[PDB]
Amino acid sequence: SSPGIWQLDCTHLEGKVILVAVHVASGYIEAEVIPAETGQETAYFLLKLAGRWPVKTVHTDNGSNFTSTTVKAACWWAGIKQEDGIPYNPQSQGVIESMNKELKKIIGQVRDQAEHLKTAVQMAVFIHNHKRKGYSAGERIVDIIATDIQ
Amino acid sequence: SPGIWQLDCTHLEGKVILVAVHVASGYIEAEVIPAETGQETAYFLLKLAGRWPVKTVHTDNGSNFTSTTVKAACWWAGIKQEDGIPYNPQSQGVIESMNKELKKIIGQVRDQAEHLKTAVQMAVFIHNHKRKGYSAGERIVDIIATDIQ
Numbered sequence: 274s275s276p277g278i279w280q281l282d283c284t285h286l287e288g289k290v291i292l293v294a295v296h297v298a299s300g301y302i303e304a305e306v307i308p309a310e311t312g313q314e315t316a317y318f319l320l321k322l323a324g325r326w327p328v329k330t331v332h333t334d335n336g337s338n339f340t341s342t343t344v345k346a347a348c349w350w351a352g353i354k355q356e357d358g359i360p361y362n363p364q365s366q367g368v369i370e371s372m373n374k375e376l377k378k379i380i381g382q383v384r385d386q387a388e389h390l391k392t393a394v395q396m397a398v399f400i401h402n403h404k405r406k407g408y409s410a411g412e413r414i415v416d417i418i419a420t421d422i423q
Numbered sequence: 424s425p426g427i428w429q430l431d432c433t434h435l436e437g438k439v440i441l442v443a444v445h446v447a448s449g450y451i452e453a454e455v456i457p458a459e460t461g462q463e464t465a466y467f468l469l470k471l472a473g474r475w476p477v478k479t480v481h482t483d484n485g486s487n488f489t490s491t492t493v494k495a496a497c498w499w500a501g502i503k504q505e506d507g508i509p510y511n512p513q514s515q516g517v518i519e520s521m522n523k524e525l526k527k528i529i530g531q532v533r534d535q536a537e538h539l540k541t542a543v544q545m546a547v548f549i550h551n552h553k554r555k556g557y558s559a560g561e562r563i564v565d566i567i568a569t570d571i572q
């Protein structure tokens with residue numbers, strides 16, 4: 274059910290990991306900076322996400338997070354269906370690749386406005402979610418979910 | 424009213440829990456920090472405004488109202504920074520009640536995690552999903568969607 278479907282995505286910058294959750298139907302994102310991708314960090318990130326949005330399904334970003342018992346436990350706790358992230362639709366690869374490139378571009382555009390990478394990443398999340406393509410991703414997610422509630 | 428949020432700072436286990444409440448719905452976001460500083464508050468508001476359409480923030484105290492770093496974050500994120508004087512006296516009570524409820528939920532989950540931050544996010548989850556009938560999470564989405572249309 275597409276209002277509740279999210280995709281995890283892991284990218285790297287400045288020797289750190291940027292963990293991203295994408296709301297598939299809207300393109301809305303949440304993101305955080307962590308030193309390395311672990312099951313515990315991924316689990317915590319998903320717990321945060323599901324407290325904020327009605328997360329029904331998460332397509333994990335790799336096999337390690339799919340396998341992780343801690344991630345499975347977080348998904349159990351938060352009522353999330355944990356699924357693999359095999360791109361059965363080949364367009365998905367491209368969309369995520371394109372998103373990572375866009376995010377890194379925005380981070381470069383703001384990078385001197387903050388000392389810490391985490392701040393620049395949150396500026397990039399802000400800009401991404403507010404950009405009108407006409408609706409923004411932030412508007413699209415709210416509309417999609419509200420329509421589903423009604 | 425769809426865009427109005429209130430900051431709230433409470434304490435547990437020698438740490439600070441910073442909360443943003445969406446006033447019209449009761450929906451919350453929260454984080455654990457070692458101490459409330461301008462920089463931590465600024466970062467928290469930047470995160471919030473990237474996720475929801477934040478028009479106005481009523482700050483939790485005079486130090487965050489005064490903080491140039493907080494003012495800068497509000498400028499950056501397009502937020503109107505306001506004071507938190509409870510002109511409506513019922514506001515005090517509502518926030519006091521919310522902190523008590525949150526601490527109660529944290530106690531109910533506290534042994535399910537080592538770290539306080541995990542327990543706080545469990546409490547955020549439970550609070551936002553609780554039906555009182557809609558949940559706070561449903562209310563915020565409905566309020567904002569109605570405003571967009």
Ligand SMILES: COc1ccc(CNC(=O)c2ccccc2CN(C)Cc2cccc(OC)c2C(=O)O)cc1
Pocket residue numbers: 385386387388389390392393461462463465466469492493495496499
């Ligand atoms: C989000 O609120 C903002 C408030 C003001 C600005 C304007 N930019 C600068 O003044 C600046 C520019 C370059 C280097 C350092 C600075 C000053 N620092 C303190 C900004 C900063 C604040 C809060 C948390 C932070 O990281 C946790 C950081 C950081 O540096 O990453 C940006 C963001």
Ligand SMILES: COc1ccc(CNC(=O)c2ccccc2CN(C)Cc2cccc(OC)c2C(=O)O)cc1
Pocket residue numbers: 312313314316317320343344346347350534535536537538539541542
């Ligand atoms: C949200 O994902 C969950 C995964 C599993 C559970 C079930 N509870 C336990 O297994 C447990 C219970 C008590 C003490 C330690 C633990 C094990 N730890 C590792 C849980 C944990 C995971 C991720 C991040 C964490 O903090 C950053 C923590 C933490 O302890 O705070 C809850 C939540």
Ligand SMILES: [Cl-]
Pocket residue numbers: 281282283284334335
């Ligand atoms: Cl990925």
Ligand SMILES: [Cl-]
Pocket residue numbers: 290308309310311
């Ligand atoms: Cl890694």
Ligand SMILES: [Cl-]
Pocket residue numbers: 439457458459
């Ligand atoms: Cl403090």
